[PDB]
Amino acid sequence: VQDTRL
Amino acid sequence: GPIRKVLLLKEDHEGLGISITGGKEHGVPILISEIHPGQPADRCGGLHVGDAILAVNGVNLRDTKHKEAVTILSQQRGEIEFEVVYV
């Protein structure tokens, strides 16, 4: 998967 | 498992302070992969790594692609309610 910081 | 409703407060110049992974294209839910120290999620508590985010502010994330969830999550402001379940 991707990994996205929010 | 139990679905928890978790509150988080943040100013607009702040991030949520979480990272997410997963999404419909991967056949898995939107999952919390990291909680960043000192940021709103960490300070407010209640979220944990491995939680599936079922909804945020009443907006269902159960069948969202990764980028959709990123959009929805990133557009929430102020007082934010997550509904999560640890998987």
Ligand SMILES: *[SH](=O)([O-])[O-]
């Ligand atoms: S936090 O503002 O909800 O602790």
